[PDB]
Amino acid sequence: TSDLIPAPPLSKVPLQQNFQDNQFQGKWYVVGLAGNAILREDKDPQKMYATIYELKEDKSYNVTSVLFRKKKCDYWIRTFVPGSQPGEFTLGNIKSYPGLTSYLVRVVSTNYNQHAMVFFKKVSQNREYFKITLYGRTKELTSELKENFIRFSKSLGLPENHIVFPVPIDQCID
Ligand SMILES: COC(=O)[C@H](CCCCN(O)C(C)=O)NC(=O)[C@@H](CCCCN(O)C(C)=O)NC(=O)c1cccc(O)c1O
Ligand SMILES: [Fe+3]
Ligand code: NA
């Protein structure tokens, strides 16, 4: 019913040193997308989408994804609660997602004003899913940065067809 490439040990997912949560606020474009449930589809290629991070009084993030689907904009909202160390988070109100028993976020690297790599891992219906997002402050990033993403995705066991670069669009995400 399902076959998944295993989640890597956390020992080989770096953590961004000295994480500045206020500086990580704002809109990010998903320019690179990889994971064990992520699969390249040339018939119907992945459209680019955007994720907005905004701190609250209590320093949790209100994370809002906006994506273009069925000729409309869909708004996926959830809370990231600070975890064991800075740059590391857990999901708030996990109770509202049936089957979901675990959720981890980890900021691998970022220069705040241009690019970022973030690692996600969830366990749901006892199935362990993980993904890496290549966040871009603009819709385009350099070749260097994208290969860096490609080769990092591979260091966690992902083949080429599990790595995608969503195609830039104008609807919803601007
Ligand atoms: C992550 O971005 C994505 O491309 C889409 C977002 C959906 C947007 C679609 N839509 O609503 C639109 C276009 O309007 N979703 C995933 O690929 C799922 C696959 C696992 C599904 C688990 N599952 O329920 C099954 C049946 O396989 N998610 C993850 O792989 C995943 C892994 C770790 C942490 C997460 O939070 C995840 O979501
Ligand atoms: Fe998700
Ligand atoms: Na270049």
From Swiss-Prot:
<dbReference type="GO" id="GO:1904440">
    <property type="term" value="P:positive regulation of iron ion import across plasma membrane"/>
</dbReference>
<dbReference type="GO" id="GO:0071347">
    <property type="term" value="P:cellular response to interleukin-1"/>
</dbReference>
<dbReference type="GO" id="GO:0071356">
    <property type="term" value="P:cellular response to tumor necrosis factor"/>
</dbReference>
<dbReference type="InterPro" id="IPR002345">
    <property type="entry name" value="Lipocalin"/>
</dbReference>
<keyword id="KW-0813">Transport</keyword>
<dbReference type="GO" id="GO:0071456">
    <property type="term" value="P:cellular response to hypoxia"/>
</dbReference>
<feature type="glycosylation site" description="N-linked (GlcNAc...) asparagine">
    <location>
        <position position="62"/>
    </location>
</feature>
<keyword id="KW-0410">Iron transport</keyword>
<dbReference type="GO" id="GO:0110090">
    <property type="term" value="P:positive regulation of hippocampal neuron apoptotic process"/>
</dbReference>
<dbReference type="GO" id="GO:1904373">
    <property type="term" value="P:response to kainic acid"/>
</dbReference>
<protein>
    <recommendedName>
        <fullName>Neutrophil gelatinase-associated lipocalin</fullName>
    </recommendedName>
</protein>
<keyword id="KW-0391">Immunity</keyword>
<dbReference type="GO" id="GO:0097192">
    <property type="term" value="P:extrinsic apoptotic signaling pathway in absence of ligand"/>
</dbReference>
<feature type="binding site">
    <location>
        <begin position="49"/>
        <end position="51"/>
    </location>
    <ligand>
        <name>a carboxymycobactin</name>
    </ligand>
</feature>
<keyword id="KW-0873">Pyrrolidone carboxylic acid</keyword>
<keyword id="KW-0408">Iron</keyword>
<dbReference type="GO" id="GO:0071222">
    <property type="term" value="P:cellular response to lipopolysaccharide"/>
</dbReference>
<dbReference type="Pfam" id="PF00061">
    <property type="entry name" value="Lipocalin"/>
</dbReference>
<dbReference type="GO" id="GO:0140315">
    <property type="term" value="F:iron ion sequestering activity"/>
</dbReference>
<dbReference type="GO" id="GO:0006953">
    <property type="term" value="P:acute-phase response"/>
</dbReference>
<feature type="disulfide bond">
    <location>
        <begin position="73"/>
        <end position="172"/>
    </location>
</feature>
<dbReference type="GO" id="GO:0007614">
    <property type="term" value="P:short-term memory"/>
</dbReference>
<dbReference type="GO" id="GO:0009637">
    <property type="term" value="P:response to blue light"/>
</dbReference>
<dbReference type="GO" id="GO:0009635">
    <property type="term" value="P:response to herbicide"/>
</dbReference>
<feature type="binding site">
    <location>
        <position position="122"/>
    </location>
    <ligand>
        <name>a carboxymycobactin</name>
    </ligand>
</feature>
<dbReference type="InterPro" id="IPR003087">
    <property type="entry name" value="LCN2/LCN12"/>
</dbReference>
<dbReference type="GO" id="GO:0071481">
    <property type="term" value="P:cellular response to X-ray"/>
</dbReference>
<dbReference type="InterPro" id="IPR000566">
    <property type="entry name" value="Lipocln_cytosolic_FA-bd_dom"/>
</dbReference>
<comment type="similarity">
    <text>Belongs to the calycin superfamily. Lipocalin family.</text>
</comment>
<dbReference type="GO" id="GO:1903981">
    <property type="term" value="F:enterobactin binding"/>
</dbReference>
<dbReference type="GO" id="GO:0071354">
    <property type="term" value="P:cellular response to interleukin-6"/>
</dbReference>
<feature type="binding site">
    <location>
        <position position="103"/>
    </location>
    <ligand>
        <name>enterobactin</name>
    </ligand>
</feature>
<keyword id="KW-0406">Ion transport</keyword>
<keyword id="KW-0964">Secreted</keyword>
<dbReference type="GO" id="GO:0036295">
    <property type="term" value="P:cellular response to increased oxygen levels"/>
</dbReference>
<dbReference type="GO" id="GO:0009615">
    <property type="term" value="P:response to virus"/>
</dbReference>
<dbReference type="GO" id="GO:0015891">
    <property type="term" value="P:siderophore transport"/>
</dbReference>
<keyword id="KW-0325">Glycoprotein</keyword>
<dbReference type="GO" id="GO:0110091">
    <property type="term" value="P:negative regulation of hippocampal neuron apoptotic process"/>
</dbReference>
<dbReference type="GO" id="GO:0031669">
    <property type="term" value="P:cellular response to nutrient levels"/>
</dbReference>
<feature type="binding site">
    <location>
        <position position="131"/>
    </location>
    <ligand>
        <name>enterobactin</name>
    </ligand>
</feature>
<dbReference type="GO" id="GO:0010628">
    <property type="term" value="P:positive regulation of gene expression"/>
</dbReference>
